[PDB]
Design a protein around this ligand. Structure first.
Ligand code: MG
Ligand code: MG
Ligand code: MN
Ligand code: MN
Ligand code: MN
Ligand code: MN
Lengths: 86, 287, 683, 287, 683
């Protein structure tokens, strides 16, 4: 189970989600991998997933996208989103 | 962002009834037909009666429930204009054109009139329903107030503007134009106060407030059409007055930050004729 | 709601979490089938159409007479042989609303896209059928887009001029000011934008023939020109847009800048006069060192030295002016003035910042004159000479006033066809034809400079669209490498075509021998530096195309020395904000403002996705406001080194950034060699 | 017998602080001691608070309960003057003479000053205790309003008048004199309305109302003494101001139809020195 | 306060119930002794003064070189032999503040009254010592007063033009409008006021090259002219004043009047542009019968008939225009337009009302052109031909544009000296010299008409002063009889001097043979009616002077027929403003506005009683506002019948008199033959 964060350095909401993902890694990092990808440097992957805004969080399980969340989310909402797929 | 600017515009528009001499209107008044004189009297009484509600209740009740010293001051100024300036101006026009007995009879008639009463009581009902510390009820009253200032007056204003644009009843038409100019800014200002409340609401609550505003507009509009035919059919003007009502309804909606409801129409040309520094700190010249 | 608009409204209706970009093709198909074909008047044959259009004062009969009817027929057939289909609804809507010929009642469509293109090609060729078909292939492939005046008015009778912009030098006299107003109104009547240089006008409080403190400065002239442009506003089709340019060392610089302040009173505020500020390197040096600067009174300098202040080198003459007691001046703070410029650009987008020394350090025609000001779009940087208009019955000393004939290359279509050379040469020929056929009787200096300088403007567009559709980020070094290579090839082929035209006609532009083209100084960086792509991905884009090497540039330099150059100026990148829709291209070399533009035409909103925008290239089409402005400056400076004139460089700023960030971007642009800065757009 | 003449007097007295240029006071202000400037700022801030509540609350609420459109028009006009003209004028003075931090500090000082809070609590409490159709609660609020107009302002007015009388701060002083001219007529008018209600009562009820008025006056007076000492001891004027407020207390009582309560005293003489379109016809074309 | 100002304030300090009028002479004495004699530069001799003034570029050398120093010294002695003394302090104050030459730092005074008069006389004589002495006697007796431009700038290097007015015809073209702006600025920088005829400009919503609804009307041209006059503000010392005239049958007449409304928005309002309305008799007829009128689009009429709207007799062609479907118009109400005129004049004093048929009924030069418009002072009525200013490097068709060569007779001093003939002839010679020496290079039509028509303006002032100082009420029939006789004498001797100049030079004005002077139609009422006084009291005023008779007028008519007439126009009564103080005279032929003028100068309040005011003639000096405007119209019409041009007729209205009263005054003026109405001054 992987939480992929599509972000950019200029994105205000993406700066707000960064500390939330660090807390989530401390609490769940034994069962959840967190991956960050900068869309400004990695446009092919952002294009492949049909991402069309940021921040975008993909829950992947064994390489397949099982859930998609757009915009800022608090920690508890990200935990609920990931715990469905653990 | 706006109260001090409106303060300025309001106080610089200050005027008094005595400034316009009314007696010279008798030189065109005497040449109007009975139906024209009748319509004018009835329209004038309609405006007078509605404006009294705004002076005694509408503006003071909104001033009471709105928070902010500067807003209360602007609202007080507007209430003053209704009671001290507009009301005296309407009375002056009446006393010039009709004898005392005729004035009393016209007011008796308009006081009993079904279409005038329907709209007057609908507006007053919303003012009476404002509850302390309830911004939803305040917003509803503000919508009612904007509809009066920016929409309901205009079925009435049409006729004095129509004469004014033709060179008839120029002194009273000048007075009406000054009154109308005050009501326009009143409507815009109260509209901004309503948008402030609206913008503090959830999306579901916003949709609900929009439905309220459109539903209220529809009720008032359908009654305006009846009011219009009742007064203006006898002088053949109702079609053009209806266009003027819709045009002003759209302005009222825009004052409340809403989209226009009615398609754009041209208006009668006679009535139209009547109407962050940050200092350079060095090291910014080197890269 | 119209069916085509409703289908275009389905773009933002996201299904499966994706934009329905395929609805735009449906939108354009509905638009055509339900409006354009129904509202297009059809003739039994092309002969009937041409006869009807010539007889009804729609077309000039002169330009169609050089071709036999079979030649015109075959030109039209080869225009329709392409079977061009508009890729987006907005392209067809913009064309058939702005450029397509309509009847006198504006109720029926007389011109298709392939008819406008055919007529423009027949105008360009001037009697040559093969050249007309070459132009038809050039435009129907959308490799080259003639400027809006040229595309709209070529071959038409109810036309203005084919020149998009005019630059007037205003001398310091009442005769010259009145004649400048007259010429501004005449050229605005022709439809072209007018830019005026007010740096020669003497300052406020100066002396008029021993009568001291009598002048109103340049601001009175700005009011006069503003009312002239309001009066000659093309009857209301489009408001008369004029430009006023003033040197930053003019005394009236603060009064010149205060015209765009919102708090400014109506007695000093202009409304239709765009303002531009010319900043020599001396001003930047003074601001950097924080020394107190002096703005000077131009008439005192003229009396002391015999030359206008903008005619002398500021970097050399500044200390002499300051140490001259006879040169009146007032003390200013250059850093405070820079902050005022930044705040003015933040609040209104004005003034146009022009770095004079950045223009004149690589200006090829400094012998004719230094570039003292730019056009209304801050991209036409040409030498100009002021005209001394004398009294009535007295012969006027006519100078050179810049006339700019614009044309745009579609980088996407030029690169996809692997036709940089042919497109650039055909565009140069078309611009030469436009310059030749253009005469302006009411502007003696504009006409004289058009005949002598023969300067043309060959711009480019769809840079960001091409990069994003090729998976290249506009801020990436690969994008700058591609811009370097592509614009080096464009400059190479423009110079080659200019030299070929000079050889064929046996004549070069006036005072060519003193230019860097004749001396070879222009080609030094081209015979010394190789501009081939440094990235294999970029080099693969130029596959099948001969990239000019150092030896090829040496051969071109020798060819220019032997035969000369027909055009004083060839390349200038205009914003091209209107014709970009028709060509399905991003405006200019600027990055895209919005991925999906929201436009309201009537009571219906019409969304325009960027050309080629899709899911795979969404984050390649990064909006200009989200981009680092330093990277955009780097891109434009990479492009600017291959453009002899300027580039309409618009600054796209966020509301979070302050006036110090704007000043930093301005100074980085000055340091990187940016010639002009057009606008400061805030989001 | 009086409303019309008060209406005419009020509207003819209309003014705005912007009519008076204040930059002329800049030097005489600069020249005052720190103690003098402090007392002056605080004095005007206390006045600002009183006018804020008189405009926001006092005058509108009395207007609501008083019958008759003309009486309401006068009271509405007076309300507008309080918050749209008077309260605002003090900010014009502050913005001219003082830096923003000193202005911020003095407004913070009004919030925490116990005498100013007590007097506001007492006066506004009585305004908000008015019950519809209950003339006694209305009388009590009108007494409170007269005491605000004709007594409470005067501990504040003393100091601008004291300077004006010495030829100091004369532009600010001109504003203050205009404010004082307004309050004098406001106190008389509200006094006459209070007397109307008082005169309807039995002798027994009247005796209770006099007790209320005198008890309230004494309570306000004792608080005003402490306020006066707090402000004026640092400028050496407390005893002089006390004589002035007693003088004005008697004027307030007289405005209410009551006998003077304090004995006469000599007031500082400086402060006393501080006080047509006629259309054409067919016969105009032949001569 | 100064001693002289303090003494002047004792005029209103009443002792024994009478004003202290004798204090005014003490005020002059104090003013001179304490200010003037101290602050006038005195030289050891006239030679040193003349050398200082010519060398320091205060005087022109060319006009003084025509005389030997002995002649100049004799002329100056003649000026000082009179020992002229100002009888009121305000006269000396006006002269030594406005017209006396001062040093470049304005600290001292270089010219006395006897010095300015001597210099003006030496300029007028042009090398003749006896003529210079005659001019000195004429001006130091204050019989004749050259206009403010002529008196101020005669013989001075730092000057403008001696011409007071410029009447420009604006043709219906952008080139012609641009040239109108240029010429307006070039004549405003010269000082003289400029009036423009805008009736030829096509209305709003007209076509520009077959595209409809393109013009923005004459209001845009008024905006351009207003900003042009604001720009040419003559240092701001005297603001640029310009007039715009429009025929009342022009379609834009309502928008033309709407610009003077106080309620008018800043987007239409013009400030520095005075407006005048030209009313043909047809409009008055339409208003009289209360029938719907039509305002026509000028360009439709020009297209249909090949002639401009204002070149065609509307009394004849109004019906032809109305029944012409190819002529565009909209129905208007002529009585409503008259009421709009009346209320506009009540509110702002605008527009000037020009009764075209009243002007052209007795216009001598109708063959050259009918009088289509008046000047800024609404008193010059001359034939003008429009100039077709073509595109650059194309020859322009130069027409005729009117100019003011103004001079005023002081009726009091003229009739006290019993020298009507000598004063009129010398004034005519001086005005002829001013017209001849005027050479304006930047206004081609103005220069051509000055050379051809040779028109001059000889006005009169101090009519009310003379009448009141002789015990005659202004409204009394004896005053009208005196005005009739005096102005018939003035016309007789002006015609005689014009014919004498034509005989002595051998040339008349251009197209004289078609004028009524050549045909003898002008002299019909003079050879058929006797204008000798009908009152014994009035006849005694002319005792000692030969009043021309019917036989004398017949001899003059024969003399004109044989020898011609040098001036197309000779007489026009200007308002005679600030220079009326210097001459100690009432302004123009208008009645006095106030018996004692209350004027503010600096921090002082100055009082100016009208000349000759005292207890005996206090009620003869009736205030203008107290007069019956109908009797003032009678007086002016009595004067108007002897003035070939117009009279600056200002209406003095009470506050109680409505717009109907103003319209009655206007219609009575039209009925009585009044040509122009200048101002509506409401008290
Ligand atoms: Mg010059
Ligand atoms: Mg033309
Ligand atoms: Mn109202
Ligand atoms: Mn209102
Ligand atoms: Mn108050
Ligand atoms: Mn009060």
């Amino acid at each position: 189970v992987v939480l992929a964060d599509f972000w950019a350095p200029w994105c205000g909401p993406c700066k707000m989600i960064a500390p939330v993902l660090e807390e989530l890694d401390q609490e769940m990092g034994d069962k959840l991998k967190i991956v960050k990808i900068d869309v400004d440097e990695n446009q092919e992957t952002a294009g492949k997933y049909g991402v069309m805004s940021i921040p975008t969080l993909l829950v992947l399980k064994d390489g397949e996208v099982v859930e998609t969340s757009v915009g800022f989310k608090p920690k508890e909402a990200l935990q609920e989103l990931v715990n469905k797929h653990l | 962002d706006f109260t001090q600017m409106f303060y300025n515009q309001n106080v610089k528009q200050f005027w008094l009834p005595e400034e316009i001499a009314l007696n010279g209107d008798l030189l065109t008044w005497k040449y109007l037909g009975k139906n024209e004189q009748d319509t004018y009297m009835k329209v004038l009484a309609g405006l007078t009666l509605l404006d009294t509600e705004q002076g005694n209740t509408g503006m003071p009740i909104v001033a009471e429930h709105v928070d902010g010293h500067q807003r209360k001051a602007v609202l007080n100024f507007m209430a003053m204009m209704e009671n001290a300036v507009h009301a005296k101006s309407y009375s002056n026009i009446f006393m010039t054109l009709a004898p005392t007995e005729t004035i009393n009879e016209v007011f008796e008639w308009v006081k009993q009139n079904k279409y005038l009463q329907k709209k007057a009581q609908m507006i007053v009902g919303l003012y009476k329903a404002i509850q302390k510390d309830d911004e939803i009820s305040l917003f509803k009253a503000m919508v009612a107030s904007v509809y009066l200032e920016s929409f309901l007056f205009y079925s009435g204003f049409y006729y004095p503007l129509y004469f004014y644009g033709q060179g008839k009843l120029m002194q009273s038409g000048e007075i009406i134009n000054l009154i109308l100019r005050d009501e326009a800014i009143h409507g815009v200002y109260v509209g901004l106060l309503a948008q402030e409340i609206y913008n503090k609401q959830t999306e579901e609550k916003k949709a609900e407030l929009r439905e309220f505003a459109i539903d209220l507009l529809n009720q008032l509009y359908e009654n305006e059409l009846e009011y219009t035919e009742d007064l203006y059919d006898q002088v053949g003007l109702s079609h053009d007055v209806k266009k003027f009502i819709r045009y002003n309804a759209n302005k009222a909606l825009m004052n409340l930050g809403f989209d226009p409801y009615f398609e754009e129409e041209d208006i009668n040309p006679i009535v139209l004729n009547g109407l962050t520094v940050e200092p350079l700190k060095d090291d910014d010249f080197y890269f | 709601v119209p069916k085509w608009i409703q289908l275009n409204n389905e773009i933002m209706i996201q299904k499966d979490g994706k934009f329905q970009f395929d609805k735009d093709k449906e939108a354009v198909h509905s638009y055509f089938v339900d409006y354009i074909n129904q509202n297009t008047v059809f003739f039994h044959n092309l002969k009937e159409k041409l006869d009807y259009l010539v007889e009804n004062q729609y077309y000039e009969e002169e330009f169609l007479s050089l071709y036999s009817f079979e030649d015109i027929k075959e030109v039209f057939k080869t225009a329709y042989a392409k079977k061009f289909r508009f890729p987006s609804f907005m392209s067809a809507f913009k064309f058939y609303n702005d450029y397509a010929l309509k009847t006198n009642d504006k109720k029926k469509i007389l011109e298709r896209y392939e008819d406008r293109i055919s007529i423009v090609a027949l105008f360009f060729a001037n009697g040559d059928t093969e050249k007309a078909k070459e132009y038809v292939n050039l435009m129907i492939n959308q490799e080259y887009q003639p400027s809006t005046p040229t595309f709209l008015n070529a071959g038409r009778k109810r036309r203005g001029e084919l020149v998009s912009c005019f630059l007037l030098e205003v001398n310091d006299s009442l005769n010259d000011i009145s004649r400048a107003i007259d010429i501004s109104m005449q050229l605005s009547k022709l439809g072209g934008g007018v830019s005026l240089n007010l740096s020669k006008l003497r300052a406020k409080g100066e002396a008029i023939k021993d009568v001291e403190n009598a002048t109103k400065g340049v601001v009175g002239v700005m009011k006069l020109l503003d009312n002239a442009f309001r009066y000659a506003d093309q009857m209301g089709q489009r408001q008369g847009s004029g430009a006023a340019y003033l040197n930053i060392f003019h005394r009236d610089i603060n009064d010149f800048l205060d015209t765009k302040k919102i708090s400014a009173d109506e007695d000093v505020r202009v409304k239709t006069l765009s303002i531009g500020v010319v900043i020599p390197d001396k001003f930047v040096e003074l601001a950097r060192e924080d020394k107190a600067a002096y703005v000077f009174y131009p008439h005192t300098i003229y009396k002391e030295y015999g030359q206008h202040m903008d005619e002398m080198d500021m970097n050399e003459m500044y200390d002499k002016f300051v140490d001259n007691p006879r040169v009146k001046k007032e003390k200013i703070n250059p850093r405070k003035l820079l902050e005022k410029l930044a705040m003015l650009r933040s609040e209104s987008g004005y003034p146009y910042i022009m770095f004079q020394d950045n223009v004149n350090k690589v200006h090829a025609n400094n012998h004719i004159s230094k570039v003292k000001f730019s056009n209304l779009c801050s991209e036409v940087l040409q030498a100009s000479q002021v005209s001394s208009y004398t009294d009535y019955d007295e012969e006027d000393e006519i100078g050179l006033d810049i006339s700019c004939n614009l044309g745009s290359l579609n980088i996407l279509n030029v690169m996809e066809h692997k036709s940089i050379e042919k497109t650039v040469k055909l565009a140069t020929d078309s611009l030469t034809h436009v310059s030749e056929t253009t005469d302006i009787r009411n502007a003696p200096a504009v006409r004289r400079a058009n005949k002598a300088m023969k300067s043309i403007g060959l711009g480019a567009m769809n840079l960001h669209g091409y990069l994003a559709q090729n998976g290249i980020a506009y801020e990436s070094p690969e994008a700058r490498d591609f811009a370097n290579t592509f614009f080096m090839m464009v400059n190479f082929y423009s110079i080659q075509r200019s030299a070929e035209i000079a050889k064929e006609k046996g004549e070069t532009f006036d005072q060519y021998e003193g230019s860097t083209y004749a001396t070879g100084e222009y080609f030094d960086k081209y015979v010394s530096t190789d501009f081939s792509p440094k990235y294999e991905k970029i080099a693969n884009l130029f596959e099948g195309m001969h990239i000019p090497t150092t030896e090829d540039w040496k051969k071109l330099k020798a060819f220019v020395a032997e035969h000369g150059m027909y055009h004083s100026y060839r390349l200038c990148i205009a914003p091209t904000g209107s014709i970009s829709y028709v060509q399905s291209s991003t405006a200019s070399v600027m990055p895209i403002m919005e991925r999906i533009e929201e436009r309201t035409y009537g009571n219906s909103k019409t969304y325009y996705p960027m050309p080629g925008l899709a899911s795979n290239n969404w984050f390649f089409y990064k909006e200009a406001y989200d981009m680092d402005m330093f990277k955009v400056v780097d891109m434009i400076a990479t492009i600017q080194q291959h453009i002899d004139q300027g580039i309409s460089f618009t600054l796209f700023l966020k509301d979070t950034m302050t006036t110090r960030d704007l000043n930093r971007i301005d100074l980085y642009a000055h340091h990187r060699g940016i010639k002009t800065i057009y606008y400061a757009r805030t989001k």
